[PDB]
Amino acid sequence: AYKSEKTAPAGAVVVKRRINEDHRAEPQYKERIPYLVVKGKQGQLLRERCVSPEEFLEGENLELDSEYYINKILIPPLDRLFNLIGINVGNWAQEI
């Protein structure tokens, strides 16, 4: 149910890679596929990293994208909740 491979979600890439390695690993409809993001080259797409937990744990030199997590997943919601007070958590994060 995706318009194209370019518009597919990040978990779809992981599922497709697993299907490529074994055709029996096809997920059911509307099944949550776990994945993590890992450090990569500058300018790399988010879907390009898309490390599965099985691949992440077995990976020898795979590291969690601390900068991506801390900024994208943490700063926006905290700013949305805390800009109504008058402060932004971005300064606190950049000071550390």
Binding site: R24, E26, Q28, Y29
Partner: protein, 55 residues
Amino acid sequence: SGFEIHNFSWGYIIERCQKIHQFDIVRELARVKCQIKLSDTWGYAHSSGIMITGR
């Protein structure tokens, strides 16, 4: 029942019987010997794609 009946549990048995043994186990599991048709994509995508007569 079964936690995942499509790729495992009853679905695996049905697929194996249909492919290797050429056996219609769905007819045998029904409560009527005769009178049971088409694949149900709605059931597979939403709930209980398999259909056995009377169960």
